[PDB]
Amino acid sequence: MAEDEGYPAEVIEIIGRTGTTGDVTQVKVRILEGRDKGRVIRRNVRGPVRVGDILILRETEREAREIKSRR
Numbered sequence: 001m002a003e004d005e006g007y008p009a010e011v012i013e014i015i016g017r018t019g020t021t022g023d024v025t026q027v028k029v030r031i032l033e034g035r036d037k038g039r040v041i042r043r044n045v046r047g048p049v050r051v052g053d054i055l056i057l058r059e060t061e062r063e064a065r066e067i068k069s070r071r
Contacts, residue, residue, distance in 0.1 A: 006056040007034025011049055018044055025049065
């Protein structure tokens with residue numbers, strides 16, 4: 001319906017837990033539409049999930065901290 005300012009992604013498969021940051025949960029989702037339509041990525045969010053979930057990625061962030069420490 002014209003609306004294309006955000007491409008929703010449906011969970012295709014769950015990876016598991018992440019923790020560290022705070023009981024994080026990484027899951028893989030695929031683009032339902034938006035040119036690409038068919039792009040699987042790995043988004044990290046807090047809380048569980050269930051195959052079917054849908055969420056738009058207005059940015060998806062990145063967070064390229066890259067701890068200089070590196071030990």
